[model samples]
Target: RFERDAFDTLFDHAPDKLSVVKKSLITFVNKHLNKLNLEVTELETQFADGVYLVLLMGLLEDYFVPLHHFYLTPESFDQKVHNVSFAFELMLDGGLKKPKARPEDVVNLDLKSTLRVLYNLFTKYKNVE
Candidate 1:
């Protein structure tokens, strides 16, 4: 039942399945992030800066991204967007297809765009460990 709608377009219109998938992705991310005492509540706002997204990639991919590679505390919109672009690059290196969500949109706190990126991560890495 849930698997059938996992990739549905309800994300933009209907809220029922959207919330379900969102909550599941949140839990999936937190399960790994909790190792570093990090947690994500509001996926849109927290991920907009791209710090956690980078860290999440590191955790799931089993590698440590050097601090110098990204802005640990991104203040400018440009920095945030860059971090997201870097994250997408990492996703590509990890062999995932390029996501339709743009880095600028993710940095702008676009919920649908953010969810799409996370959904990609959730599907690809959910079964690991």
Candidate 2:
């Protein structure tokens, strides 16, 4: 359930467009990746604790993050896709976890709902997780 406001918290300001959108250059735009507990190249990650997901939601503000805008070269597409997918997956898994949910008062996302939200966030949605 990462709506528009939740997404906007992820970025610095407006959705930035790097001057030369290559993998190396994109790193400059990757300030928020670590904040989301993601690695640039690690396409497979698991950070699905409720707090983490909520934190990621705070990072991924609403906007249009054109993958190509982050990379000047076409070759970066595949890797960028993987990275973005990984990022989304992490967020989706975290979606059902309420920000205030604690270890004593907690539950993970339902598999189906998590998957659906993730699908929308990744394919249909744009900037935020």
Top candidate (TM-score): 1
lDDT, model 1, position 117: 85
Best candidate according to lDDT: 1
CA deviation > 4 Å runs, candidate 1: 1-8
lDDT string for model 1 (19-90, tens) is: 788889899989988988999888869999988899999998998999999999998999999899999888
Residue pairs with clashing backbones, model 1: none
Candidate 1 TM-score to native: 0.90
**TM-score, per-candidate, Cα-based:** 0.90, 0.28
Please write out the lDDT profile of model 2 over residues 28-74, one tens digit for every residue.
22445575455443111222233222333446543334444332231
